[PDB]
Amino acid sequence: GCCSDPRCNMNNPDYC
């Protein structure tokens, strides 16, 4: 998933 990447977790609270 994108939350597998630290970036998506920070950048996108929608994704995570």
Distance, in Å, from the CA atom of 10 to the CA atom of 4, rounded to the nearest integer, reads 11
Name the 3-class secondary structure at 8: helix
Name the 3-class secondary structure at 13: coil
Instruction: Report the alpha-carbon angle 5-11-16, nearest 5.
Output: 65
Distance, in Å, from the CA atom of 4 to the CA atom of 8, rounded to the nearest integer, reads 8
- What was the structure determination method? NMR
First to last CA, the chain: 9
Neighbours of 13 (CB within 10 A): 8
Distance, in Å, from the CA atom of 7 to the CA atom of 1, rounded to the nearest integer, reads 11
Q: Which two tokens stand for residue 12?
A: 């996108």
Contact 4, 16 (CB under 8 A): no
